Structures are given as C-alpha cells and as structure tokens.
Amino acid sequence: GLAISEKMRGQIRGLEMASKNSQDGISLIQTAEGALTETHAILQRVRELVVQAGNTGTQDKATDLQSIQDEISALTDEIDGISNRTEFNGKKLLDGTYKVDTATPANQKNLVFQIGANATQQISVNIEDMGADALGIKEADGSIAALHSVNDLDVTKFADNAADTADIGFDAQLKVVDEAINQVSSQRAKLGAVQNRLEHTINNLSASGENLTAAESRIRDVDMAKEMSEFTKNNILSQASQAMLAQANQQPQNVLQLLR
Amino acid sequence: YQQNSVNTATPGELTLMLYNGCLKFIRLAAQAIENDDMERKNENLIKAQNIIQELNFTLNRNIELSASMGAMYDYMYRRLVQANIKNDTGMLAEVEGYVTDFRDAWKQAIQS
C-alpha cells in the first residue's frame, strides 16, 4: 500500500516536472519566434526600400538615395538590436551564442530541454546568429564575404552602377536582402518544428497524468465546459456542507508554496 | 507576514485563497501575453495550473460533488496548458470565468 502510493506519487511528480520543463522550453522558443517575426518584417521593409532606391532615373543620390539609405541603416540597427537584446531568463537567444559550431564543435553551446523524467530524454536546440552581419549571401563554408551582408547594404551605390554590377548593383544588393529573408524564415521554421515537438510532448504528459490519476477528462469543448461549470457552481451553493467535505482538504504549507 | 494568514485560515478559507490565487495568476498571464512577455506568461500559467492540480488532488472522492468538480478541474488544467501553448488570451478569459464561478460560489458556501 505504501509502495503503491510512493510509486504513484513519484510518477505524478515526474510527469509534472517534465511538463513544467517542456512548457518553459516552449516559452523560450516562442520568445525567439516572436523576435524573428519582427526581424522578418523589418527585412521586408528593407526590401521595399531597396526596390524604391532602384529607380535611380528619378532619384537623386545625395538627397533621395541617402535618405533611403539612412532609413535602411536605422532598420538594420534594429535587426542588430533584436539579435542582441532578445533573451529568456538572461540567455541571449539570437546573437549566435547557441549557433551550430562546425569549425570547432567543442565550442558549441546548446539549449537543452529535459522533456522527460529519465535519462536521455532531452531535446537539444541551436539558434543561428540573426544579426545583420550574419544574414545575406553565404559562402560555401557558411561565412559571409565583404559587401554581402545586410549590414553592408548601401543603396547610394545604385546611382553610379548598373543593376547587374557585381556585389553592389541593384540585383546583387536585392539578393543580399532576399537571402537574409530566407535565412530568417528558415530559422523560424526550424524553431516551429521544435515547438510542435514540445506541444506533442506536453499533450502526451497531460494525457499520461490523466490516465494515471483516473481523471475525468470527458469535457472536451468550451460550451460543454461552460454548462458543467454552471452546474458545479450551483451544487457548491446548494450543498455547502458537501462542498466543504469535498474540497476543503488542503495543507497550509502547500497553500503558502502555491501562492508565492 | 502572509505566513500568518495561511496558518490562521479555516479549511474553507484556505481553499478560497487558492481560487483567488488562481485568478491572480491567470490575469497576470493574460497581461504578459499582451506585453509580448512569453517568459512571464509561462511562469504565471504554470502557477495557475499547479493550483488547479492541488485542488483536484485534494478532492475527497468519497463525496459525490467531487466528480463534477474534478471533471471541471481537468478541463481547466488542459485549457490553461493549451492557452500557454497557443498564447491565447481568450482561453484565459474562459478559464477565468470558471474559476470566478467556483470562487464566488465557494465564498457563499463557507459563510456557515
């Protein structure tokens, strides 16, 4: 009897901690996803400004193109700001701290979620650098060459260079922006796949605790829950002494802990 | 400070503290979603979940009323987890409504 209750309490608490861990992890992933949605939107605005600056026949370099470039530089400063400030419990998620390290794998830092209560039950997550100097046209080795990152954009160069000019023509600078957009989209999609895995993990943990405790889990939609809530409220009112017997069974020390 | 209040509370008052605490954490979580603060959202939804689980686990299943209370707590727990996953303040307002129902009814019940 004691052995059964001890085994059950240990199972329940293990499931509860795994679920807390996994929800904490999904809230870190959501933090990164929300920040990258903003980076993506900034990059789309940069793209519009590059298209605008490409109309060099109607744009003056020292006024119009410089004004566009000043706006682009402020936007890429904001990309850098997002990459440097985005944090979860102090961990910088987007500045490359947690990137994959090909060149020196011992230096790689990972975001680890302990999603079960047992050995090996982890997910390991990496996030690439989402700063403006890390987005753009990548070399075969994953580096970015001079003039090929979002931080290097300079649309005033369009005034004096045809659109097909290597590296600095309109076509090449637009390609920097489009590669950056694809890289941010790819990073968002990879994090979304992690979020989907965590969601499935959390729902399995909830279902496991429900089966373990013989929970009544039949309420499965909002309108039914509303109806059953009114029923329960009325029965608390109409059978007050029964309600006290049913529920008024907590320990003060547990209540104190839960209200912290 | 608050230690005294839990230790001087009747059993009925202890449960009422839990209902009110659950409401506070749900409301903090909804504001955190509006603040785009995922970290604070999650912390408060876990605290709300833990109160619902404590209420469920301290039901006396020999009492007939416990069956319907437990079914509501199981739904509320699942709905708070889904609200955390989906960042859905409408789900929070839904569960806030149910907890308020229990709280208001419990407060009348413990009158005598």
Residue numbers in the entry:
A (entry chain D): 45 to 304
B (entry chain E): 10 to 121
Text taken from the publication that reported this structure:
The most abundant flagellar building block is the flagellin protein that assembles in a helical pattern of more than 20,000 copies to form the extracellular filament. Successful assembly of the flagellar filament relies on the FliS protein that prevents cytoplasmic aggregation of flagellin10 and guides flagellin to the cytoplasmic side of the fT3SS. At the fT3SS, the flagellin/FliS complex interacts with the cytoplasmic domain of the fT3SS transmembrane protein FlhA (FlhA-C).
To obtain the complete structure, the flagellin/FliS complex from B. subtilis was co-expressed in E. coli BL21(DE3) and co-purified by nickel-ion affinity chromatography (IMAC) followed by size exclusion chromatography (SEC). Crystals of the flagellin/FliS complex were obtained in two spacegroups, the primitive monoclinic space group P21 at 1.5 Å resolution and the primitive orthorhombic spacegroup P22121 at 2.1 Å resolution. The flagellin/FliS heterodimer shows overall dimensions of 95 Å, 40 Å and 40 Å and could be built to completeness except for the first 45 highly disordered residues at the N-terminus of flagellin (dashed line). The crystal structure suggests that the flagellin/FliS complex forms a rather compact particle detectable also in solution by small angle X-ray scattering (SAXS). The two proteins interact by an extensive network of hydrophobic and electrostatic interactions with an interface area of 2600 Å2 which can be divided into contact areas 1, 2 and 3. Contact area 1 is highly similar to that in an earlier structure of FliS bound to the C-terminus of flagellin21 with a Cα r.m.s.d of 2.2 Å over 140 amino acid residues. Contact area 2 aligns FliS to the D1 core domain of flagellin, a region that was not present in previous crystal structures. Interactions within this interface are of more electrostatic nature (Contact area 2). Notably, residues 46 to 57 are kinked by 45° in the orthorhombic structure, while the helix is straight in the crystal structure derived from monoclinic crystals. Apart from this difference, both structure superimpose well with a r.m.s.d of 1.5 over 329 Cα-atoms.
